[PDB]
Amino acid sequence: EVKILVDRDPIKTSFEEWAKPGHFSRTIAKGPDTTTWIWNLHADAHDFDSHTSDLEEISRKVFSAHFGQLSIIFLWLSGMYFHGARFSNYEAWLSDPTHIGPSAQVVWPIVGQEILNGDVGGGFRGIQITSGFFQIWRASGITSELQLYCTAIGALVFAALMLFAGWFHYHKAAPKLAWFQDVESMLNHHLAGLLGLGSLSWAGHQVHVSLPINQFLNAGVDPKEIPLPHEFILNRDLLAQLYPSFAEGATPFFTLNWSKYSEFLTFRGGLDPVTGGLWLTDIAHHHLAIAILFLIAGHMYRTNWGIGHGIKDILEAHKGPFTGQGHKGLYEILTTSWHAQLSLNLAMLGSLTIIVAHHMYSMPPYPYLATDYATQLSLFTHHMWIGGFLIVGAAAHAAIFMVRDYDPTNRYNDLLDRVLRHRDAIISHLNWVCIFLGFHSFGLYIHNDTMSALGRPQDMFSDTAIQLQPVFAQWIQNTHALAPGVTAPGETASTSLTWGGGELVAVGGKVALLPIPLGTADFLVHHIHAFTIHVTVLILLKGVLFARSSRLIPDKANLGFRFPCDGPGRGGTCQVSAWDHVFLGLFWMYNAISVVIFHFSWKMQSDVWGSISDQGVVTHITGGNFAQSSITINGWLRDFLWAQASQVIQSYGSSLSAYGLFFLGAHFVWAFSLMFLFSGRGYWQELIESIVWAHNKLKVAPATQPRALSIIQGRAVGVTHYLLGGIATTWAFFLARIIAVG
Template identity: 60%
Template sequence: MLFFGWFHYHKAAPKLAWFQDVESMLNHHLAVATRTWVSLGGHQVLDPKEIPLPYEFILNRDLWLNFIPICRGATPFFTLNWSKYGLSYFSWRIRSESGLWSIDIAHHHLAIAILFTIAGHMYRTNGVLILTTSWHAQLSLNLAMLGSLTIVVAHHMYSMPPYPYLATDYGTQLSLFTHHMWIGGFLIVGTAAHAAIFMVRDYDPTTRYNDLLDRVLRHRDAIISHLNWALAVGGKVALLPIPLGTANFLVHHIHAFTIHVTVLILLKGVLFARSSRLISDKANLGFRFPCDGHGRGYMSSIGTGSCLLRTIRMYNSISVVIFHFSWKMHIMALRFPRFSQGLAQDPTTRRIWFGIATAHDFESHDDITEERLYQNIFASHFGQLAIIFLWTSRNLFHVAWQGNFESWVQDPLHVRPIAHAIWDPHFGQPTVEAFTRGGALGPWYTIGLRTNEDLYTGALFLLFLSAISLIAGWLHLQPKWKPSISWFKNAESRLNHHLLGLFGVSSLAWTGHLVHVAIPASRGESVRWNNFLDVLPHPRG
């Protein structure tokens, strides 16, 4: 292989026309795949090997006849006694090791080889393929096929295990499933990314008028809106007759929702890669045009920003799938004999396991107490608060750093608010018009912030709250400060604490801010630290 690589690069490099001969290339690939499947099927029939586990198969070769009833080598072939090679079809698993019959696998490979042989002679194209003019389009299709195939392999490896004893090796099953699911997820995201790059760089609407892709782009708003409604409403209507009884049904509903949302975002990013209502000149800005999130009015549908959003949705989808599969493997594993299939299907059991969020890491919680579990959940809430404060501080910081907030506040009638004042030669006027309506500056003006110093101060204060929340989460895990189980189960005290400490104090603090900061600032008065003492809520008192 190394020699062929060197030879075809230095001595006999193919021409560009050879790479763009799509029909010949596809026929060639189908022929290679055909030979591969025939060779693999023949190997399984003509050259069976012993299975190393269990050890009986090493000591007694005759046991191999239970898996492949053909151990006659190539003699029947040369003696024209081909009936000896008749492939059977047992259609399901062997009970002893829960694997597919190897004779069925050989039969399967032979059938695929025949289909590919026929397809290699039937394929013809009726028009000019975009694959010959855009490498990104070709890569996008290849990633789509490979990513889909990888995800299919992830599920087939445990539902129809091809290797003996793989079905009962739960650690290997979980590792293979996780490995293939993550690879498939990234390949699918790459599909949409390179399709969007093709739309921005290689697609020419003047030469592709009224073809299939052009008609799809002209109806993209209707397509996306219909898919949005189908996803938001259609699924719920279809599920109305089914009672939400078990967590098994709920988690499959989550799978359907997250996967379809991810695909919808991928499709939207491709269809709106060249332009959208918010930014009509994406094709001129380029795929690498950055997205600053909140500083630009939440415009995450720009090139790489859209890819980031797609990747996050893919993370969510794959994480839920792996969580469910991990829980399934833990429930069915032989090292947990106290769990059975019936218990795993019980609604109460599933509701408890999902509720306490320990199914993804069951072994680490085998010896955990109820008190320790509540303490972990309580501490994690502080971490979630820290993330919220950190996220909001980013919003303030971007508006102060890259916007014209102060200029707009001083002369709102003549200065248009823009959240990104750094000029780009490709930053067209339609984009500027879109940013002026982004609304990134309005909320901070409404709550009384008037200068960049106010924005930076607010961002630092939120960062301080984020750090305090992280420290509080760590502190409540220490032996001296850990709450007891009785504290968590005191429902009356907890309810009073939430009503008074969270809703009461926060509402009172927000009212004070509006009265002593936001309202005076809206009148044009200077806001100082002693506003609480000398600034009246109303000019007349």
């Protein structure tokens, strides 16, 4: 059934098409009559569904494009590991990681920018990075710079291999459509073979290399004194001196006597109190169990043999009573459309990035991550933003499916039809609950603000005036703190210490994630988060559902996914397109993730992070001013924005001065974006035609006719400059704030 259907030499390797730009499209492969052409050359560059009509060439194009992306990421990791090897203080950071700033970038002394090379620590002048690569490397048992250079060279090798792979799998031997459509084998392999064997091999590294090395690094051993990792593979006596279960080898394994493996495959949940990260002993067992699970999960789908679930046979089996035929047809609209799959995988990968952000602060998995408050904050914020962007792109590509790849005649689905038929009910109830949440989450902030301004602090919604305690979250918190016991024995402690009954993991002078107390401010801000998420889903789901038709435009699909409008008629029908809906959902994702990372930064700096002296008195970075000031907007303006932006603006003449520079610059780029979002094309075309008169007066009339940006392009430029500016403002503000007071 499944096979390796692949055809040779379909496309010629030649620069002939490089010389002819815009070759991929018909209207673009004839010349730039205008300047918009170049914007259409980049816009449609990766719109392979519009270049061709057959799915075979599209699948080959995106396959080799994924290979290019993997080449890029291998080259990026090459850069990171190399810069760690040569331009870093990692060899010194291992000695005193609680006081040396992790730095992996040095600037060139030319124009005074050598101030950026600051006193990170370790006898090294550079930039205090906030990526957490140093923490990984301590978790990977690197203990050198040679290993990092070798890793960089190997990553460069794999980058070149992936580049050759894309070239081979497009130009030399490109797979045909029967190969991609065999999703059964693809899932069987990516579950068991990528995620199963990948987690298994990382468990092997974690058992053989990370665990024995971190058993010494945490035990006051200098990295120069540690035995090399391969010495544990060659000499098992040195490995057994700390974990004697290796003296028996795999006889405990194959005889199912796993009870004599707990020296290195543990379940003692919680954070290693010597470094603040999770127990690597638990992470080895984790990735091992995940290997078992993905290995049994990747033998689920029939590929060639009589066993396995045909995914058609799973989907067609589910047919609801008043839900109609049910999931029949979905295997044909997911295997004959890349955009549907792209949307699904984007949505899940984005929510997974967010879950990563959430589980990487509350269960610090790397050593000296929780105490590197810059790394923790930056990683949470990063992955939150990536998740929001991926979800918003999932919306865009659901819409693109609905416009292009949706065919109720051939590739019919029942549930999608049922969703389209009461789409007004969906959007009406979402448009209601967004207003309800908006009111009962932000009008509460307004109420607190007014009551505090009228001198009525006894009337706010605070932890002192009117109790809005998260009773449900408090119950989950208290039962997860008292989870070690009847419900989860053999764990020795809670799976995390972000719950009230937990304890404080004092690492050096720092505090590293004691319990998080949930009060009225957490209720208010969590409902603000639900609000912003619900409005984003309103906008995006509305764009997806009404991508094809509305009461306003019933032929919206014929106009396309990415179109500005259908004229000033009907009172005006700007931004009816799903592209414009996702362009608005970008702003709302921005507001959502911005208030999310603000909640994170403030709740952490006030209720979690800080410094605990040897007497035991923990003093937080702000001073616990979240539950009292995060109930009103003036606190976010005063105690969070105004106050914590006293280290990014005062950082002029310091090592953190590029942060204030990009603070002002990202401010600027955001505001500059407002020139695009607010304005319209017609003014700029008329202005351009005036200055084109000024040029034609001097025989400087360019043949590529100067055209103002297309409307959808003005909206794209506006949203990208707006997001870049707000996000770089926040990035600079967070990084300078959290590196300065640290």
